Design a binder for this molecule. Structure first.
Ligand code: ZN
Lengths: 175, 203, 361, 256, 196, 202
């Protein structure tokens, strides 16, 4: 599963935009789009928000968790517990990248947000590497990977699983 | 069933099909419903006056759903092409009351593919072979799915007393109590029925 | 509302759309899993009276004969009392915070534990003296035919003393599975007469190479018979390699297992848990397995399947070797255990009972 | 002290430098490189000088004129950043290794004959050709001493880098000078000395080429063999009446 | 000994790992078939000699020759199947019409297999849903926008859209066409996706 | 989406009939002794003058032939282990597994070692353990080399790896490059496949 497909699953979260045009309700297959009134918030899927921002027709409102204090608290919590910790969103990295790259004049203090998300990502990736090493060293058959997002799995997947398959084949041969 | 739930079922089927080593159960009803909705929405979009932004919204949504449907069908086709003999043999001995694994079109496609392969191999090589050695059993040559591959999963319905490595006592802990919403790394053979019954999602 | 007069709401479109008995196994199982169509819930929520009666029955050697079939197991007190009786064994060393049954090849579960005997020496001597007394008492019980058998589990090898008559023999025996050349030569220089049933000095080493090939392997099984078992007991008590002097199991005396009480014994119980399926864990001795099968035959109306997990270094005990009423065993168990060993270096891995017929796998 | 502020500024430079535009994407350049090198087993990084100037012009200007202390602070900052990026290390690798920082720049190179006496203890960039080398000896960095009489121990003494020693104490705190170095309680690094010759074209007419002694340490050893054209970036320093030998502590090599 | 030609034929295929269907090797297959026929004749003669005249010592030779024959069949079967695998991808990459360059390296039976595979694939595509079916070959990447900027890389005459108007594809020219009309051209190598 | 999908080799004691790599691994020769002579097959031995191979001769037959002619009765052929799998090299492997060169020892080490288990011997429980411990000991360095190597010549890192480890290295390298290309915003380009470009090169 390539990273583009993982982004494709992260382009369906809900974000708030403040449009400038006016449009009535739109009946999409996945839901009902709220009435589009200028200078009035209307929640839309992330792909629509990105398209509107690229076409100069909206103004993205930052999500709640995108604050310096909250991100610092999350980073400090992550660097404290041995196992993984819950994240403010299951697609925090993709959301951060897309929002900070496509709409940075609306989001304030983007640089510190990008610096803290990166630290949390680095710590979680190091924990995942330790988990993989311990799994292979101990010749285990099960592992509990809680609170782990999809992109972090995609980083090491298709390498961990194949190594485990070969190890299992070499582990039960006389039987 | 709202259309949103139909789309969610399509997404779940797509993800489950991508990570499974074997060919999972067919879901032709969802495919037909999604296809019908797309077909209706095409004309619904065509009627609308040009220059409307709703045209862009609906067209983007249609392009966003068609890709998922095509990817799911492509994965099924590739799995059928890689393991046609075993799949056909399992279909021949299918028992009533067990859900089918192949839609009729896929069954016809598999038959045609097997016929093409057998005819080509026979005509090209087997005719000029020694008379004693001219029969090749495709059930013992084409590879088989590796049901022991490790997969990632997320649990939806709680399961208790799950046996890890049932055939060996070497493992220190052999019992796992799966909770709701947790994720585990485990072999596919152990949790195949859970995926089949919808209690576990492969992500 | 704004759409062209042919627009169908997305929801609107979807609205429109067989031997009598199994052969005797002398290996030590470590986990049992019984599966049956009927319910195993009778072996749960045992009352206090049932447990007390089971313990007393085990200590007083009471034989229980259940009827041919039971239709209401949950209301049968005899069945549950017999279950509690069947889940009782005796182990000499009583250290609750240390694992003691699997002593060979178990270091992950022995890591990071509070072991004061590893360093202190007077404590180790006290433990050794108590172990010697318990071993002597157990052998004396075995000699008078008041105990059928007992296992001695060191950290390198395992011994099994059998009474006179068991496994087709006619005298007291003893079996040491992983023997080495040095240990065998030490036995020779003490009066023990054993028999394995399975540069000029450089040339002598070459000759020993044929002898030292299967060492540290199950093919070095040693069989001692007759009165030599007494000298074997004394040698084992006075040996200097029974107790490890370096490692995780440093200073820990060997574990003693027995189906009957002896001086220094500690009453123990096996863990039973039903999920239909029933799981029993712990050191499983042959009499426990036979009693469990006898109970499940009546409880499940002669239809169940069993999956046995075996301790590998004790599988070679099945090697053939050829008045037990007071030994404290059921007469059916005595009849089964007084057979001829058919298996060799092999242990049961799957037992299936259908329509009161046994088809072991 | 100002040392702590400088170290914090270097850490911020390492943690916050990014390359790219918002039309394609941004990638942190030195933090990722530090993580990758530390996981691979190579404990070094190559820090450019225009990047540091763009981040903080004062910090770059304090490295072109007082390289010793500022380079030491930069190396300590690199060690701390590398420790925080790979914080959950596997069992047995809890202790954090020291990181060596190499410098690089695109400035116009100087000449060996243009090195005045004013440019002492300054970063210089001189080309040349290597004509000699020595065997890889050992240079101490951490030493522990012990008294001969009362066997008092003073451990974890630090020795300055380069061809510079450590004056041993006289008072025992037991005759005069009772301290000897404990052999096994010493941490050492690689050590090599080269000879750089002036380029064949920069030599004036009717004159033999001049030479200059170089100093290489840790991962810079065994990188250049005699007969190679190199461009050297290093610290001009000193090792008749008042005459002192001058060498060049090499902090970067670009083999041509 | 034996099987040398077969193993050389397998090595030839294994050298070109990244697809790149090579020219069909006929002489090697002919020599392998001749060797197999000779081995079969000698084996049958030995079998008759051991059958009627009582020569029990010839059995290991029969086993040896039978094993050699089995290996020779295995090599040819694998060689044919790998070429089939390489040929299949041409349907999914180079549209439907095969370029003459690739066709020149294909055998007649392989071409018939390709045509039958194409017909079966088309039938399956049409079977899906109502009217014209859903073309699985297209839409091979997640969608991101409706219109994409593209630039030609070679002359391709004129490319027609459903509106009835063609576009003169000349090298170094750019058009702001919709995505769903150019994806196949991009994948074939006739266009290049230009990003801002 | 990889266009060309060849048949994967089968690890363990079982091969794949259609696998090309397994078709080359079995070609490797193995020491053997002819327990019962092969009459009329002496033409195979160029040095031997007789038309029949005598009883008791020793030859290095290919693995496929040894597997075909083998029988537990051991009346037609006997198999001797190669040097790499005997005790002398097994102890060296047990010493440290990251220092050996499993590309010169044998291009297929794990596969051939597993195939050696088909022939019965009293040392199989040790061969299997040695192979498993070698893989376990060499996994970590392969993972670290594959993950943490961006824009650098990898020919120096894959020069001492056998084919299975090389495939694992390729998997790790393609798992790293995908993420790095995503972060740099180059994953949003519709590009032709590698096969098309390689064909265009011709
Ligand atoms: Zn002193």
């Amino acid at each position: 599963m390539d990273a583009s497909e993982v982004e494709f699953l992260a382009e369906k979260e809900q974000v708030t935009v403040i449009p400038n045009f006016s449009l009535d309700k739109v009946y999409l297959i996945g839901g009902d789009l709220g009435p589009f009134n200028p200078s009035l918030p209307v929640e839309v899927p992330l792909w629509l928000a990105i398209n509107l921002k690229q076409r100069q027709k909206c103004r993205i409102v930052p999500p709640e968790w995108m604050d310096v204090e909250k991100l610092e608290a999350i980073r400090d919590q992550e660097r404290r517990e041995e196992t993984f910790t819950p994240m403010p969103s299951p697609y925090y990295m993709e959301l951060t990248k897309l929002l900070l790259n496509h709409a940075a004049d609306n989001i304030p203090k983007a640089d510190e947000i990008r610096t803290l998300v990166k630290d949390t990502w680095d710590t979680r990736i190091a924990k995942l590497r330790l988990s993989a090493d311990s799994f292979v060293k101990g010749q285990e058959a099960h592992a509990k990977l809680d609170n782990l997002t999809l992109m972090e799995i995609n980083t090491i997947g298709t390498f961990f699983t194949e190594s485990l398959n070969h190890m299992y084949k070499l582990r039960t041969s006389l039987q | 069933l709202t259309p949103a739930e139909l789309i969610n079922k399509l997404e779940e089927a797509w993800l489950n099909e991508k990570f499974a080593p074997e060919l999972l159960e067919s879901k032709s009803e969802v495919v037909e419903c999604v296809m019908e909705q797309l077909n209706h929405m095409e004309q619904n979009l065509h009627r609308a006056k040009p220059g409307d932004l709703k045209i862009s919204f609906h067209h983007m949504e249609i392009e966003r759903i068609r890709y998922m449907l095509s990817s799911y069908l492509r994965s099924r086709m590739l799995k059928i092409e890689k393991f046609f003999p075993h799949i056909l043999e399992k279909e021949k001995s299918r028992g009533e009351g067990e859900p089918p694994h192949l839609s009729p079109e896929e069954f016809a496609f598999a038959k045609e593919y097997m016929t093409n392969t057998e005819t080509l191999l026979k005509s090209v090589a087997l005719r000029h072979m020694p008379p004693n050695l001219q029969t090749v059993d495709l059930l013992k040559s084409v590879p088989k799915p590796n049901l022991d591959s490790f997969v990632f999963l997320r649990v939806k319905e709680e399961q208790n007393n799950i046996l890890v490595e049932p055939e060996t006592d070497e493992q220190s802990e052999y019992a796992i109590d799966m909770e709701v919403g947790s994720q585990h790394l485990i072999r596919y053979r152990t949790i195949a029925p859970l995926v089949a019954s919808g209690a576990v999602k492969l992500i | 509302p704004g759409y062209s007069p042919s627009f169908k709401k997305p929801s609107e479109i979807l609205r429109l759309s067989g031997s009598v008995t199994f052969p005797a196994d002398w290996s030590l199982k470590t986990r049992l899993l019984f599966t049956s169509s009927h319910s195993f819930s009778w072996a749960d929520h045992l009352k206090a009276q049932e447990e007390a009666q089971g313990l007393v029955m085990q200590c007083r050697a009471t034989a229980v004969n259940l009827p041919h079939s039971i239709q209401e197991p949950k209301l049968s007190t005899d069945l549950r009392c017999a279950f509690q009786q069947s889940l009782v064994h005796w182990i000499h060393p009583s250290l609750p915070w240390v694992q003691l049954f699997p002593r060979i090849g178990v270091d992950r579960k022995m890591a990071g534990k509070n072991t004061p005997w590893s360093q202190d020496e007077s404590l180790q001597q006290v433990l050794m003296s108590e172990w010697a007394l318990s071993f002597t008492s157990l052998y004396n019980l075995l000699k008078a035919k008041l105990c059928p058998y007992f296992y001695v589990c060191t950290y390198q090898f395992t011994v099994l003393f059998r009474a006179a008559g068991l496994a087709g023999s006619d005298v007291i025996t003893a079996v040491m599975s992983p023997t080495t050349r040095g240990l065998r030569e030490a036995m020779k220089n003490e009066g023990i007469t054993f028999s394995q049933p399975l540069d000029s000095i450089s040339i002598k080493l070459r000759k020993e190479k044929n002898e030292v090939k299967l060492d540290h392997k199950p093919e070095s099984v040693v069989l001692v018979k007759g009165t030599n078992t007494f000298t074997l007991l004394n040698f084992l008590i006075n040996c200097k390699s029974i107790v490890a002097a370096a490692g995780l199991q440093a200073g820990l005396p060997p574990t003693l297992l027995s189906p009957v009480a002896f001086r220094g014994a500690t009453m123990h119980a096996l863990k039973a848990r039903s999920v239909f399926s029933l799981e029993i864990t712990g050191p499983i001795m042959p009499h426990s397995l036979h009693s469990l099968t006898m109970l499940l035959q009546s409880a499940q109306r002669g239809s169940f399947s069993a999956g046995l997990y075996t301790h590998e270094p004790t599988a070679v005990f099945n090697t053939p070797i050829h008045d037990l009423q007071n030994c404290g065993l059921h007469p059916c168990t005595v009849e089964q255990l007084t057979q001829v060993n058919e298996l060799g270096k092999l242990s049961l891995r799957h037992l299936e009972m259908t329509d009161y017929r046994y088809t072991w796998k | 002290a100002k040392k702590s502020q400088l170290k914090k500024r270097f850490r911020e430079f390492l943690r916050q430098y990014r390359i790219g535009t918002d039309r394609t994407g941004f990638t942190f350049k030195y933090r990722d490189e530090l993580k990758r090198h530390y996981n691979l087993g190579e404990y070094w990084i190559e820090v450019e000088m225009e990047d540091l100037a763009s981040f903080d012009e004062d910090l770059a200007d304090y490295l072109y004129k007082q390289p010793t202390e500022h380079l030491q602070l930069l190396e300590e900052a690199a060690q701390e950043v590398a420790d925080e990026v790979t914080r959950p290390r596997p069992a047995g690798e809890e202790t954090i290794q020291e990181i060596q920082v190499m410098l690089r720049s695109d400035a116009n190179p100087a000449n060996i004959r243009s090195l005045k006496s004013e440019q002492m203890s300054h970063l210089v960039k001189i080309p040349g050709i290597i004509i000699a080398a020595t065997a890889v000896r050992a240079k101490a960095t951490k030493i522990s001493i012990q008294c001969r009489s009362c066997r008092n121990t003073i451990g974890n003494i630090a020795v300055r880098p380069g061809l510079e020693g450590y004056a041993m104490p006289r008072k025992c705190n037991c005759p005069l000078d009772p301290y000897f170095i404990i052999p096994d309680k010493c941490k050492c690094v690689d050590f090599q000395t080269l000879k750089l010759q002036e380029s064949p074209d920069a030599v004036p007419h009717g004159e033999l080429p001049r030479h200059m002694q170089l100093y290489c340490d840790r991962y810079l050893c065994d990188k250049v063999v005699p007969g190679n054209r190199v461009t050297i970036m290093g610290i001009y320093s000193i090792r008749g009446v008042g005459i002192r030998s001058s060498y060049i502590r090499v902090v970067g090599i670009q083999v041509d | 000994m034996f099987c040398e030609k077969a193993i050389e034929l397998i090595r030839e295929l294994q050298r070109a790992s990244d697809g790149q269907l090579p020219a069909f090797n006929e002489d090697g297959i002919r020599q392998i078939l001749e060797e197999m026929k000779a081995l079969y004749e000698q084996n049958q003669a030995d079998v008759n000699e051991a059958k009627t005249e009582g020569r029990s010592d010839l059995i290991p030779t029969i086993k040896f020759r039978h094993c050699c024959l089995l290996r020779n069949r295995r090599c040819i079967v694998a060689y044919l199947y790998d070429r089939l695998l390489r040929i299949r991808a041409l349907r999914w990459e180079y549209g439907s019409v095969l370029p003459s360059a690739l066709r020149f390296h294909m055998s007649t039976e392989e071409m018939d297999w390709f045509n039958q595979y194409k017909r079966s694939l088309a039938t399956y595509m049409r079977s899906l849903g109502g009217e014209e079916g859903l073309d699985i070959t297209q839409d091979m990447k997640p969608p991101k926008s409706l219109y994409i900027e593209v630039r030609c890389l070679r002359d391709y005459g004129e490319f027609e859209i459903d509106d009835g108007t063609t576009i003169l594809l000349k090298k170094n020219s750019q058009h702001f066409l919709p995505r769903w009309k150019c994806e196949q051209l991009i994948r074939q190598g006739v266009l290049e996706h230009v990003l801002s | 989406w990889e266009p060309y999908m060849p048949v994967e080799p089968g690890l363990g004691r079982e091969e794949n009939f259609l696998s090309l790599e397994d078709l080359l691994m079995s070609q490797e020769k193995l020491p053997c002794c002819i327990e019962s002579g092969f009459p009329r097959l002496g033409f195979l031995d160029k040095g031997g003058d007789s038309d029949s191979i005598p009883e008791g001769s020793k030859m290095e037959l290919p693995l496929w032939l040894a597997k075909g002619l083998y029988d537990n009765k051991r009346r037609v052929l006997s198999v001797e282990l190669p040097k790499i799998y005997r005790e002398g090299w097994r102890t060296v492997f047990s010493a440290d597994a990251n220092v050996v060169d499993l590309h010169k020892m044998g291009p297929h080490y794990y596969g051939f070692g597993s195939q050696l288990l088909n022939f019965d011997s009293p040392e199989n429980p040790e061969i299997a353990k040695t192979i498993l411990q070698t893989f376990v000991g060499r996994f970590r360095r392969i993972m670290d080399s594959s993950q943490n190597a961006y824009n650098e010549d990898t020919s120096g890192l894959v020069a001492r790896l056998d084919e299975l480890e090389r495939s694992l290295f390729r998997a790790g390298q393609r798992g790293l490059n995908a993420f790095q290309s995503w972060e740099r915003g180059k994953a949003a380009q519709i590009t032709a496949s590698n096969l098309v470009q390689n064909y265009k090169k011709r």
